[PDB]
Paper text:
The NQ-HaBLA crystals soaked into solutions containing Na+, Cs+ and Ca2+ [conditions 1A (0 mM Na+/100 mM Cs+), 1B (75 mM Na+/25 mM Cs+) and 1C (90 mM Na+/10 mM Cs+)] diffracted to resolutions of 2.0, 1.8 and 2.1 Å, respectively. Structural analysis of NQ-HaBLA in condition 1A (0 mM Na+/100 mM Cs+) showed ten locations for bound Ca2+ (Ca1–Ca10) and two locations for Cs+ (Cs1 and Cs2) in an asymmetric unit. The peak heights of the anomalous difference Fourier maps were 17.5σ for Cs1 and 8.0σ for Cs2. The binding sites of Ca2+ were integrated into five sites in one molecule of NQ-HaBLA, which were the same locations as the site 2, site 3, site 5, site 6 and site 7 Ca2+-binding sites in NQ-HaBLA without soaking. Moreover, the binding sites of Cs+ ions were integrated into one site (site 8) per molecule of NQ-HaBLA. The Cs+ ion bound at site 8 was predominantly recognized by two main-chain O atoms and the aromatic ring of Trp189. The aromatic ring of Trp189 interacts with Cs+ by a cation–π interaction. The site 8 Cs+-binding site is not located at the interface of HaBLA molecules but is constructed on the surface of a single HaBLA molecule, indicating that monodisperse HaBLA itself can recognize Cs+.
To evaluate metal-ion affinity and to identify protein metal-binding sites for Sr2+ and Cs+, a class C β-lactamase (BLA) derived from the moderate halophile Chromohalobacter sp. 560 (HaBLA; molecular weight 39 536) was chosen as a model system. HaBLA, although a moderately halophilic periplasmic protein, has a particularly abundant content of acidic amino acids similar to those in extremely halophilic proteins. The crystal structure of a halophilic β-lactamase from Chromohalobacter sp. 560 (HaBLA) was determined to resolutions of between 1.8 and 2.9 Å in space group P31 using X-ray crystallography. Seven binding sites (site 1 to site 7) for divalent metal ions (Ca2+ and/or Sr2+) and one binding site (site 8) for Cs+ per HaBLA molecule were identified by X-ray diffraction studies including anomalous dispersion.
Numbering used by the authors: 8 to 364
Write the structure that this text describes.
Amino acid sequence: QTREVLDPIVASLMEAQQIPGMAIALVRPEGTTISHYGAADRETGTPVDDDTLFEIGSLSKTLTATLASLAEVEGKLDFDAPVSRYLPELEGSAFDDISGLNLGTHTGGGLPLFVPDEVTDRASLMAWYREWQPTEPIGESRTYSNLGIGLLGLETAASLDGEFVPTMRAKVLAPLGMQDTWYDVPEARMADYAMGEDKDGQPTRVSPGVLDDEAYGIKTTAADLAKLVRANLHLADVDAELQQAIDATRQGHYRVGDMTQALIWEQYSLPVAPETLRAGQGYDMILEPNAAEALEPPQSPRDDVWVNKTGSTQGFGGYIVMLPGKHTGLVMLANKNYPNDARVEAAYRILSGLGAI
Ligand SMILES: [Ca+2]
Ligand SMILES: [Ca+2]
Ligand SMILES: [Ca+2]
Ligand SMILES: [Ca+2]
Ligand SMILES: [Cl-]
Ligand SMILES: [Cs+]
């Protein structure tokens, strides 16, 4: 079926990249297909199955964006307001001039990629934010940032008068039916927690860290992520406000060369060449500041685009692609951090082989 297209491509991918195990979800009108391949843990050979939890790394940022968007829909968060309006401990800092929208689009004045070493907790984090000097013009330059999306998370939590994780669960994960999605894997599920494999073939698992929940900390199944994708594709039963919040995460906010930056989601007009997709996932886009032009004709979610997001940890590699015009989506989770180029190629070949591009 679909499996005759999908299975050979994932077998070849897993052999070429030496991926121990994968979980794949294909979302289409007429339904969602879940497929599991290989081993959750190379050392034990425990197979990947419906219960296997994968670290999704930066794919976690899509949930942070979705909660932020819901707070906005509920009228509790103004996306263009200074972040210091919701975190008054940052009054008088650069965050008087930086907005939640900036943070969701990585246009927060060059806010850096990583949490610095000297930041070890919430207090030292907030002290660091207060002292930090922008290095790029706010709203005119994109630097991919864990500090930024992390702060959007803090801002959102404050705007909703709740703690980030329980609030995320109550307002987003639960209404989406994402009951196998964890920030902290309980002891009772550790036997289902896949073991990562790093680039040297060594076992590895993500460590806790500041802003982990907000920026990279989710462990989940392909099926749970498929619920989020289904909602993005208008294929789920979700209340009006959450649907509105989800749709708003796909609004185009900045043109960044060939890429359009939405709320964490990144997209490209169709037809898109794989090279363009590759250039979105490399050094030039991820590790350098890129000029960003605000779309203030604020772009309505489009139906003629390739929408995507990568996510990695040291031992895991994930990729989501959505084609709203075809009402189809793809979630690929692996317990190996394998090259973004190969994620793009596999996704493209799958979607092309299914006739969706
Ligand atoms: Ca406003
Ligand atoms: Ca099990
Ligand atoms: Ca945490
Ligand atoms: Ca090739
Ligand atoms: Cl970090
Ligand atoms: Cs849960």
